[PDB]
Amino acid sequence: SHMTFVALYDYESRTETDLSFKKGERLQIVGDWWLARSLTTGKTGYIPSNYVAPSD
Ligand SMILES: COC[C@H]1O[C@@H]2O[C@H]3[C@H](O)[C@@H](OC)[C@@H](O[C@H]4[C@H](O)[C@@H](O)[C@@H](O[C@H]5[C@H](O)[C@@H](O)[C@@H](O[C@H]6[C@H](OC)[C@@H](O)[C@@H](O[C@H]7[C@H](OC)[C@@H](OC)[C@@H](O[C@H]8[C@H](O)[C@@H](OC)[C@@H](O[C@H]1[C@H](O)[C@H]2OC)O[C@@H]8CO)O[C@@H]7CO)O[C@@H]6CO)O[C@@H]5CO)O[C@@H]4CO)O[C@@H]3CO
Numbered sequence: 001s002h003m004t005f006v007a008l009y010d011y012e013s014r015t016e017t018d019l020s021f022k023k024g025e026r027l028q029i030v031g032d033w034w035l036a037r038s039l040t041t042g043k044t045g046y047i048p049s050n051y052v053a054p055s056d
């Protein structure tokens with residue numbers, strides 16, 4: 001129940017392995033970088049964990 005998060009800020013991907021997202025986008029979490037799946041786009045990639053907070 002605790003592995004869904006919401007983006008607190010916009011983030012633009014820098015590399016081939018990170019995931020861009022918009023503030024308010026929800027991310028399912030599959031360290032400082034977490035593997036996540038966007039619940040908007042379905043794309044998977046790494047996100048900065050400090051940019052997201054738990055979402056119920
Ligand atoms: C056309 O709609 C038919 C479909 O209707 C219902 O699905 C709803 C779904 O329930 C609803 O969910 C709340 C929403 O879906 C949204 C997703 O939840 C959300 O994650 C996101 O989706 C993302 C995906 O996560 C990404 O993976 C990506 O998807 C694209 C695929 O990349 C992996 C790409 O390959 C291509 O998908 C094809 C697919 O190839 C895998 C192909 O399968 C043979 C075919 O899909 C069929 C499907 O097999 C069949 O299911 C039995 C049926 O699906 C219906 C659902 O069952 C029904 O659920 C209640 O028909 C499909 C279409 O014919 O075709 C796929 C489309 O080409 O393309 C993917 C799209 O880009 O990116 C998406 C989008 O960001 O967003 C979703 C909404 O956009 O809506 C669904 C329908 O609107």
Ligand SMILES: [Cu+2]
Pocket residue numbers: 001002003
């Ligand atoms: Cu949980």
